[model samples]
Target: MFQQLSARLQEAIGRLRGRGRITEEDLKATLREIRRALMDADVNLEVARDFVERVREEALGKQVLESLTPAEVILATVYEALKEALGGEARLPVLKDRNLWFLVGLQGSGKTTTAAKLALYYKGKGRRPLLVAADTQRPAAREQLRLLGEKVGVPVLEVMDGESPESIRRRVEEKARLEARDLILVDTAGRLQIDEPLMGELARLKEVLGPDEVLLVLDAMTGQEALSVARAFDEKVGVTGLVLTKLDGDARGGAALSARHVTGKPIYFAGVSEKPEGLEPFYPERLAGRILGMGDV
Candidate 1:
């Protein structure tokens, strides 16, 4: 989160202004709300689990989550976990920021289309995101991300045949510094079935750069075949979140919620259309509502 969290912090801090208003129970309650909201927000299970756990450990054990002096060391742990979640409590990485996401799926998964939508989603959130090719042998992966990159006005990182992994990281880092961006949205090959040479880059990318997020994007139509592919992808890529594309269509998808239950990764964005505006923040409660047969997804 950028100057981004200012509003939220200001708001939260505002509430503690009264005399003797800063109670230990009040601070603990604040962390509880964050953890619960994260759980309901479709955040990653381990990520959210640790965050809530750490806050509790501090607030309950040493009273660390209670103040600024304690915030120093624990904040880094919180930050890393937040990356695993989305963004720290401050950034909230609603749709992936503070700092990343990778789009993976089958050939017809609308992978590229959804990738662009995510660039837009995170971009709109002030993430200053950069897009990556992840060097897959998948047919035209580069071109698709390149095309979408242009449409969204975001930079693309496609490694050449001779490019070094060292340089690839350097290039991405350089591009990040050059652009002053906070995250990278990857159009990584999504193969829940088997890992192709192209698809294999995800594992390398995860290790080479250790991307901030590992999101699994599935076609809304796939609707839980793994659901259509969650188990396969989860087994292979260690998927950190879910991005179910194509929600504005006639189909009402529920696999996201199921996927959430199974994977514990939040469904961060919904692909409503081919345009940037199509990728929008998906609140978990809404899906919960939909699953209960309550409202539109």
Candidate 2:
């Protein structure tokens, strides 16, 4: 995934090792190569362009400190740009006395599994979480979530056929109160594509549930297509954060980089594997270092 881009960046920066004074031509050539690397990694066109422009501006005006090499100065600027494109910092949903996390995404985006992962993530933090299988249209989805809930040692609430979103909210509230569960992770239905009916259903559920976090689950393998899908969901249903799934197998880091830049939402989690413990909180600095192939950076 990022291996190629990392090599390209290091190579681009390596060209500046022996330069006495950083010239505009030297910086331009480096930035141009870095931008190309970003595009090769499938980053959004506008994002890749703007990312280099910022790096160029940041590097041009920077003074070469005695302790830092000219290459180190340029590396730091590019690293910062990559970090900002990655959401700048890690963010998690703030837990209140009672919390609701409405999970929504396109079908096959790993919504059901991610929901279970989130439930387990929060449960490990000592919060009693209840999983709601709200995908009434998909019969197998309910059972999948149910099985995952059992595996995670959490309770699941299944939505019956023809159950309205409002009614489901009522039931969820009552169940949470009775069970003293503070957090509720709602695994909502997803359509193959962004459709009016699906958006309406999600919006209605969001209004009724008043979720603390409306997390849009995304499949990292979708690459550039994921950006448009993210915009559609955020525009229509109002997404608060994102979850990138199937990242363990993603060779390109495009989806992860473009996700935050396009959606303007923090990526809260990344699904690194199929196991229940695979979900991990997204850290922008760490990812930036990984992309640069410099863990100590």
Candidate 3:
């Protein structure tokens, strides 16, 4: 998603490939390009400004211009700073010993599909996980989760019509305990935006399930709007982390950068592709390099 930013940063550094050392003007020019790249990526104006200032200070304080490989050293410093800005050295959520993990998001934000994908992922890890279909608002959401569970050979717990989301969750909890399922993945109903009824329903469901982890599923294509949605959800429902979907289609990848900064939550997983194996653990360094247009660092 950060193709443009990466290209600009790489181009800025490529100019000094043959130079033995960098100069103050050279470093300043490079920092200017980096600043423009971040700003153009839809980063918050103040955040972008502060980031550039910090990077400039670090680059100059380290005497980057005196380094033998000035371009590489400067780029490394930028990467490190970017990593810190994007949640430094954060580890993936430990799935072990956690019984119930819940997924929440807007209806069209890919929550149901991601729930199924996650169920299959945990199944491959040799853990028996029950997919609780609590999204009763949508006509076919429960059926979709059930069908996905069948295809993946995982059991899905779904209550019939006339059952409240909380009641369905309690039943699923009972099922998990009786079936010896190591994990229970609860899928909650979602609306297009945060509304009172939807938030209340989510709150009720949370009270019933008392989830070990509440992952807010987000659409990467929504960009900054996703950040706002996450914040609203966190304020209302108290999400433990985030799951960014549709990254494979996200050309800008700005949502990922802004979501963490705006919500102050760890991005536990990313839906890189449609396949279950396409899900990836969030790695700050790798993502920072990707944002800077370095394919792999």
Candidate 4:
């Protein structure tokens, strides 16, 4: 998916194959190549620049210059830089105490489907999860969630027409508490784009439900736009985590790289397929391999 960036990285590393040691020119060229790869992958320009600059500084001043095989050092420097840009190891999603996860996204971003997938994931983990179809604006949205709940064999909490989103959330919270469900997944309605009305509704829902986690569902195909969307959502609605969808498609996956850098949010999981079991935990190393076209390492 990140073929462009992966190829560039491979090419940059290939240049050092015959060299006895890494030189200033070689490191500089490699950084430049990495920068170009990020840019071509549609990473946010500023974030990409900052990442490359940091790698450049680290490579020039660290063991990369004096190491027996400077290329390996340079590679290590790049890997570390990538890890930082992708969110340092210190930043990770902790779901220990959080029982309620509220999912948000724009229309057609697959929020309902993700809700089902998440419910199944939790169910498989021995957690009794209740799916709440809080998105009442769209025709049949509640029915869609109910169907998915039936398919996954999880209970669904839903409300009929005329119920406010906040009320729906409150009711679902009460039900979760009464039923003693280990997890409550709330699927909210999506606007076509980021706007004040949608944010206000989401904020009210959050206030009513006091969700343990607010997850923003993003479509990987949107690429760079996904970063902007995430920023807007976090700034307005307040997202605690992210869930990137449709990665198994032809998406370049640059959005996955840029989202962490731009939003400062840990991606809790990713939707790799339409199947409920396709959701996977966030693993930067696996993602790096995928980006590099190295096939799952």
Q: For residues 1-297, what per-residue lDDT tens digits would candidate 3 score against the true structure?
A: 467766776787777777888788888887788778777777777777777787888877777878877877777777877787767786665777657888999988889888888888888878898998886666588898999889888899876765876677668867877988988888888677777987887787788778878999998888888888887888888899888888878766677766656778888888888886777777778887876667754
Clashes per candidate (backbone, < 3 Å): 7, 1, 3, 0
Where does model 3 exceed 4 Å of error? 96-98, 293-297
- Pitting candidate 1 against candidate 2, the one with the higher lDDT is 2
Best by TM-score: 2
Q: Could you give candidate 4's per-residue lDDT for residues 1-297 as a string of tens digits?
A: 555676677677666765776667767777888888888878767978888888878877776756667766667667777666655553334456437888999887788898999889888878898998886566588889999999999999887666876677668767877888878888888778777876887788788778878989988788878878888888888999888888777345678777666777887787888777888776776666455445664
TM-score of each: 0.60, 0.93, 0.92, 0.89
Candidate 2: pairs in clash: 1-251
Task: Give a tens-digit lDDT track for model 2, residues 1-297.
Answer: 367777888888887777666656666778889899889889877999999998877876686333246788888898899889889978898888888889989888998889988999998999899999998678788998999999999999999987888899899989999999999999989778888877888888888888878899999888888878888988898888889998877777887887767778888998888888889999888888777668664
Best model per lDDT: 2
Ranking by lDDT: 2, 3, 4, 1
User: Once all C-alphas are superposed, what RMSD does model 4 give against the true structure?
Assistant: 2.4
Q: Give lDDT: candidate 4, residue 135.
A: 65
Least accurate 10 contiguous residues by lDDT in model 4:
89-98
Off by over 4 Å in 2: 18-22, 64-68
Model 1, which residues run further than 4 Å from truth? 1-98, 136-139, 162-164, 190-193, 196-199, 226-228, 250-252, 287-297
